[PDB]
Amino acid sequence: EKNFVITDPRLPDNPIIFASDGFLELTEYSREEILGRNARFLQGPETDQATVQKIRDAIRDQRETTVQLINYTKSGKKFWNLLHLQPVRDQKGELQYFIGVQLDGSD
Numbered sequence: 001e002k003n004f005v006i007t008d009p010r011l012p013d014n015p016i017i018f019a020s021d022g023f024l025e026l027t028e029y030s031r032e033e034i035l036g037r038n039a040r041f042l043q044g045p046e047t048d049q050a051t052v053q054k055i056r057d058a059i060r061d062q063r064e065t066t067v068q069l070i071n072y073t074k075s076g077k078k079f080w081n082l083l084h085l086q087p088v089r090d091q092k093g094e095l096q097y098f099i100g101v102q103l104d105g106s107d
């Protein structure tokens with residue numbers, strides 16, 4: 001899809017190591033602003049904490065998940081993020097990355 005990030009869970013706090021141009025357009029950030037940061041900076045006042053906890057659980061267990069949650073652009077504008085997370089493993093079965101795809105959400 002057009003909007004995604006790749007994170008490296010083998011580095012402290014699972015930082016974004018790549019952000020697609022679509023993601024940067026969606027969120028209003030630049031590469032320099034967000035590479036090396038955990039994606040949680042997108043959350044804000046109206047983000048449902050139970051949903052965030054369930055994302056944490058999915059990441060802990062390194063499984064695919066799809067959730068919808070409120071995120072914020074750099075200028076503070078809310079959007080509904082239909083987030084799909086996909087673990088990426090090497091040939092030996094070891095986790096290498098997560099891919100997170102931001103789709104158009106609702107509600």
Ligand SMILES: Cc1cc2nc3c(=O)[nH]c(=O)nc-3n(C[C@H](O)[C@H](O)[C@H](O)COP(=O)(O)O)c2cc1C
Pocket residue numbers: 005006007014038039040042043052053055056059069071081083085098099100101102
């Ligand atoms: C590849 C990937 C992409 C993510 N994308 C988003 C995102 O777009 N929006 C968001 O609110 N959280 C996103 N997250 C989730 C946060 O990085 C974090 O896992 C979540 O806030 C739960 O962890 P925490 O309780 O430490 O914050 C993403 C996580 C991964 C691994």
